[PDB]
Amino acid sequence: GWRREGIKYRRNELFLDVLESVNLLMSPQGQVLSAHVSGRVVMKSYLSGMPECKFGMNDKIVIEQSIAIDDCTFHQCVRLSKFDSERSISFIPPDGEFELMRYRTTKDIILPFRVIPLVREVGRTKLEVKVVIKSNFKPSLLAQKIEVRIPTPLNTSGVQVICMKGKAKYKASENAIVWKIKRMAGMKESQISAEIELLPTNDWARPPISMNFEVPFAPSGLKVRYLKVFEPKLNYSDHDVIKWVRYIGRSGIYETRC
């Protein structure tokens, strides 16, 4: 139902895209209040004929570094009977691009950044706000598009702010200090320090510090182990197919209370 007969390519090739959103709510005492990963695998293929495919990943059930999938669904092309009976993912794919699988995880997530805030209320007219970020992943990988958003009080008079890497700006319109870093390798750390002058009132209610980032790995811990291909009439296998995988991990709602 998913694929027309008679497809022919000179170059048999496929691309797997592992796309994940990592979500966190962290207490000021470094307690994880909530975390999850929403993931999907997108397959784009140019395969001749009616290839029989198998997708292998580091699922705990077949490997007992393996991962706990809480829930998943698959494209209609996947044989659910074989996933229930063997934990095998077996299909004849659509041609071109489709979403093979979508999944959710909560256990043993790699939280790519640790956010360590320090807030000192000095008098009733001054706040000192410091944040350290630490990249918790291999030193050979680069995070990119890093943003740290630090909320400011509605009675902010002025901000002075410096940081050890990247650039930071007070955006009064957004009641935030916005810290941007273009790239940061794993097992690194940086720091921002702000002095917030406050307007005196008679008599703070802090939102969380949020991050944006992209990392070149699955924070679920998902690794693609194989994509087996067999076309029985054309008699080509794996060895005849050029195969690629990319991992893109993005922040979703990634909040650390201060």
Binding site: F15, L16, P216, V224, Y226, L227, D238, K243, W244, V245, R246, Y247, I248
Partner: peptide, 10 residues
């Protein structure tokens, strides 16, 4: 960024 694509061998 094509450097983000890794080969799948086997």
């Amino acid at each position: 960024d094509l450097l983000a694509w890794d080969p799948l061998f086997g």
